[PDB]
């Protein structure tokens, strides 16, 4: 039960339910750290959408330019 | 950049950084849905700790009785 989980400190490292469907940007940055094709890969994902890397729920295609997609990819890749 | 990510709606489905190291309970429940040994498995994980199912950061052993471990497992398995 939930009150026992709280009183035991469990909720310091767990949530009940994921608050966001997509991966956290720092986790994306870590997965793709050290890869020369990461910006091109991600900029295309962000623009066209995709599924199956992190799970089965898809990212819909996003309303960004190629420029904006590239920049978002560069920014996410710097997150730490 | 971050302001473009916000203005594009990206933060509806992403965080910058994971807020918790461990999996969300609803995700645990889904992974283990439909398994007769799930309560025994999880009660042991919660009590003894573990790593490598969700990632490499370990769950330390937790200060719970066997009773409490079993109940926490039963509760997490009901989360949806
Ligand atoms: C607004 C322009 C953005 C930007 C910059 C990003 N997203 Fe998403 N995203 C969502 C889901 C469900 C996933 C996982 C897809 C899969 O499992 O393959 C993602 C993934 C990403 C990534 C990583 C891509 C990869 O192949 O590793 C990145 C860099 C990313 N997104 C950026 C879900 C959503 C949304 C839900 C409705 C929304 C809105 C966005 N994402 C928006 C954006
Ligand atoms: C307080 C008593 C609890 C309870 C009920 C649970 N946890 Fe944790 N947990 C943490 C990490 C990093 C993981 C992943 C471990 C790996 O990758 O194998 C987990 C995992 C779990 C599970 C799922 C276990 C499985 O094998 O699928 C469950 C049911 C669970 N925990 C319950 C991290 C932490 C903590 C960080 C310091 C703390 C505190 C807890 N967990 C506490 C608890």
Numbering used by the authors:
A (entry chain A), B (entry chain A): 1 to 80
Quote the authors verbatim.
Therefore, we attributed the peak at 50–75 ml to HT cyt c552 oligomers. There was one HT cyt c552 protomer in the asymmetric unit of the crystal, and a domain-swapped structure of dimeric HT cyt c552 was obtained at 1.8 Å resolution. The hinge loop was composed of Ala18, Lys19, and Lys20. The N-terminal α-helix from Asn1 to Lys17, together with the heme, was swapped between protomers in the dimer. A heme is inserted to the apo protein of the transient holo-apo complex, refolding to a domain-swapped dimer.
Hydrogenobacter thermophilus (HT) cyt c552 is a thermostable c-type cytochrome. Its high thermostability is achieved by the dense packing of the side chains of hydrophobic amino acids. In this study, we expressed thermostable HT cyt c552 in E. coli cells, and found that HT cyt c552 forms oligomers by domain swapping in E. coli cells.
